[PDB]
Design brief:
- The protein is mainly alpha-helical.
- It has one domain.
- The protein is built from one helix and no strands.
- The chain starts with 19 loop residues before the first helix and ends with a helix.
- It is classed as de novo protein.
- Keywords: beta-hairpin, alpha-helix, DE novo protein.
- The assembly is monomeric.
- Design of bivalent miniprotein consisting of two independent elements, a b-hairpin peptide and a-helix peptide, tethered by four glycines.
């Protein structure tokens, strides 16, 4: 909710969670062939 500012770069995608840390990773596991 509202772009943030990390290093003078406006990020997108709602908001950045900390717990999602693992999620972002799982992002791969999710995918499969």
């Amino acid at each position: 909710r509202g772009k943030w500012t990390y290093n003078g770069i406006t990020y997108e995608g709602g908001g950045g969670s900390a717990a999602e840390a693992y999620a972002k990773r799982i992002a791969e596991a999710m995918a499969k062939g």
